[PDB]
Amino acid sequence: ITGGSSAVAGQWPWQVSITYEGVHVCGGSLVSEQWVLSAAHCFPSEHHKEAYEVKLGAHQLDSYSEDAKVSTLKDIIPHPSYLQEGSQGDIALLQLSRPITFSRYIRPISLPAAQASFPNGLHCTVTGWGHVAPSVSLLTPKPLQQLEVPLISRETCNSLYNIDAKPEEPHFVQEDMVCAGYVEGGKDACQGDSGGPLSCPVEGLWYLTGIVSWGDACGARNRPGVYTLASSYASWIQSKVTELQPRVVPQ
Missing domain, CATH: 2.40.10.10 (Trypsin-like serine proteases)
Incomplete structure (x- = not known):
């Protein structure tokens, strides 16, 4: 993170x-x-x-x-x-x-049911012990990191990844993935964070909205992290x- x-x-x-x-x-x-x-x-x-x-x-x-x-x-x-x-x-x-x-x-954490929708812009939290900068590991004693990231609309993630990125960029699938984060840079999950939770709060309960899956370099610009959409x-x-x-x- x-x-x-x-x-x-x-x-x-x-x-x-x-x-x-x-x-x-x-x-x-x-x-x-x-x-x-x-x-x-x-x-x-x-x-x-x-x-x-x-x-x-x-x-x-x-x-x-x-x-x-x-x-x-x-x-x-x-x-x-x-x-x-x-x-x-x-x-x-x-x-x-x-x-x-x-x-x-x-x-x-609660799993979201198939029809769950989490509103765009909801601030969810991603956590993990992965890299803290590109190719830089979290240092001992490796305190768990957390980062608040807003959910981004599937239309926008589709733009950022499938239209405005080179052909070798992994394919963003709107039905099954969600991107969340920032285009500004420096705030994202990174290598070593995969599989960890994108925990979103609704009415005081936390739901595993997503699982850290992929993105570009740790904290890259214009590429908010991508998560498997658990619902x-x-x-x-x-x-x-x-x-x-x-x-x-x-x-």
Whole structure:
């Protein structure tokens, strides 16, 4: 996260850290006692499920915490539309090997139901332990970063990414993605943040509106970060995981 601030402990208790062979690679969002949603691009086919770990309840990634829990994974289910290096379908369900116990520091975020709409301009928050500037990592002790970003209309994101960007720019799919952020630069999610939550508030409840998916360089100008739009995958999520019940989001 670039341009944001340090969260206080307990603030975003659904945020988790995913490591691969012990190295933090992505975020994710706890959505029940045993399931986490993250980005499919963090789980390439060639990686071994047993080499991942999920750390919950930690605000400083490099500080021991008695409140932190670490779990292995028993299943990884990427969306079947997902193609490596492609934009579509960047979302994956991860099942922890065992259910975890909730606490002040570990609690699930609500999934938005298929028909949920979040108004353009709503200030949502993206969190993570990813880069703080282009190619610059967050320094130890790696305090979780948070950044308020406004949701941007699909028409505008389509303009910014599909019309006003070169052909090698990933394709923005209006039905299944949302961009959120700034054209000004210096405020965005970055490498290492994928899979983490775009948490949007409605009537005092937080919904996983999006999952960090892609964008340009960390904090690049005219390219607000792009997120997988969770509502578009709500029916898929619930059909795969009967335990996960997306919530209807008030008008």
